Amino acid sequence: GPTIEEVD
Amino acid sequence: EQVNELKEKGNKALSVGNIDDALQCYSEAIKLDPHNHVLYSNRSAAYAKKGDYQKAYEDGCKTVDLKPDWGKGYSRKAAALEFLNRFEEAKRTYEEGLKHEANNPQLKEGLQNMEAR
Ligand code: NI
Ligand code: NI
Incomplete structure (x- = not known):
């Protein structure tokens, strides 16, 4: 599944 | 600072x-x-x-x-498209991002994934 990148 | 605070x-x-x-x-x-x-x-x-x-x-x-x-915005958009099962658009989004941040590793990986499906 797609990766949800960390928030900034 | 208030905006940063809420973020x-x-x-x-x-x-x-x-x-x-x-x-x-x-x-x-x-x-x-x-x-x-x-x-x-x-x-x-x-x-x-x-x-x-x-x-x-x-x-x-x-x-x-x-x-x-900003490359990461395209990753946000493209990841959402993948979840939406709109892979052709996801691939083009990674490609569009690369027209702005060519060496972005996350976009390169995303493109590679879409090209391998
Ligand atoms: Ni405005
Ligand atoms: Ni552009």
Whole structure:
């Protein structure tokens, strides 16, 4: 599944 | 600083698994600073974690609209498209991002994944 990148 | 404050509050809520609280924090910050791409990118992430991929997509699109040179916005948009099973568009989004940040590893990986499906 797609990766949800960390928030900034 | 107030915007950063709300963003941090949102990041913390997200860190403890309170996604709805995170969305509320990011949305309040967005009201104060509607041109802040970081807020839309973070809200896109929260919506994706929640499983509302249409809203994750809308926020990823807004991130790209506001800051087209930022590769991560295309990753937000493209990830939402993948969840939405719109892979052709996801692939083109990674490609579009690479026209702005050619050496971005996440976009390169995304493109590679879409080219391997
Ligand atoms: Ni404006
Ligand atoms: Ni462009």
